[PDB]
Amino acid sequence: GSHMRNVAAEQQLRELESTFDGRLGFVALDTATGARIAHRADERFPFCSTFKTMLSAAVLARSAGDAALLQRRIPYAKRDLVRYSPITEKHVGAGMTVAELCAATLQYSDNTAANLLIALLGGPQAVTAYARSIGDATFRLDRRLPGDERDTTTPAAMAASVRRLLVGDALGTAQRAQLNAWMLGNKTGDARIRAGVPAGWRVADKTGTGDYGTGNDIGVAYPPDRAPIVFVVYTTMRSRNAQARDDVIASAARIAARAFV
Numbered sequence: 001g002s003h004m005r006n007v008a009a010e011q012q013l014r015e016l017e018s019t020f021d022g023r024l025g026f027v028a029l030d031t032a033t034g035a036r037i038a039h040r041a042d043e044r045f046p047f048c049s050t051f052k053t054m055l056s057a058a059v060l061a062r063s064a065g066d067a068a069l070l071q072r073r074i075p076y077a078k079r080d081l082v083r084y085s086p087i088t089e090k091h092v093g094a095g096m097t098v099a100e101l102c103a104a105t106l107q108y109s110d111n112t113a114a115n116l117l118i119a120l121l122g123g124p125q126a127v128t129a130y131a132r133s134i135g136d137a138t139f140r141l142d143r144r145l146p147g148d149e150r151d152t153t154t155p156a157a158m159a160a161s162v163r164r165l166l167v168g169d170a171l172g173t174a175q176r177a178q179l180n181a182w183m184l185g186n187k188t189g190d191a192r193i194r195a196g197v198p199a200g201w202r203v204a205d206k207t208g209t210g211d212y213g214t215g216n217d218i219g220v221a222y223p224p225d226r227a228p229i230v231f232v233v234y235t236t237m238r239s240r241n242a243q244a245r246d247d248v249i250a251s252a253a254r255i256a257a258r259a260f261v
């Protein structure tokens, strides 16, 4: 790579943002060199379901020296279900193990699964506390309008957290391996980062989708013969009804992939 290719990439990101009525927040990091391609990296964006990565890491941290926690089954009932719970809705009654809940919320974005895990940790403030413990002073989970700082982070802060969690040593080696295993098996991101990077790269990712055309994807790509590349993409729009743009997310990843190859 080179600084000049990165300057070119950043202008391409600006041009990409002009194709929709909203904001593009982007960080890609080449871990081989620390080279960073960024756009609106220090602005806050609603993180939507991408917080589930930080969730799951916090749960994995509780399991250090207590691997049996992952096999502990958590009961819940129908009145405990919230909207969009495709996995948990099938296991009302006896419930699911902690590991199963982590997998459900990472791979299917199951919302009840996330709430149960948030509860296990002691509430949303425990997730924020966990983020602070790994050097993220920006992330805030306030609950399980544009401009509201609640439930937001910046692309820069999330990129650093993704890097430390999936590539670095925020977690112990075994827990890092497990977080990667879950995110590698994500089912919701086929049209996002995965669509923009080379087919030969392995991708561990977590998506986020919300109103105001909010379309997010964060994660790490593992090329077969070089160092991991961290990708964080946040998009959000001015119109509440607007669909999230999978193609824009894929295109942003593709711009950075081309620059780093």
Ligand SMILES: CC(C)(O/N=C(\C(=O)NCB(O)O)c1csc(N)n1)C(=O)O
Pocket: 048, 049, 050, 082, 083, 084, 109, 111, 144, 207, 208, 209, 210, 211
């Ligand atoms: C409605 C319910 C179940 O979930 N709300 C969500 C949501 O559906 N997140 C799904 B995700 O981004 O894959 C959400 C967060 S920001 C936004 N817009 N929607 C909830 O929190 O009660």
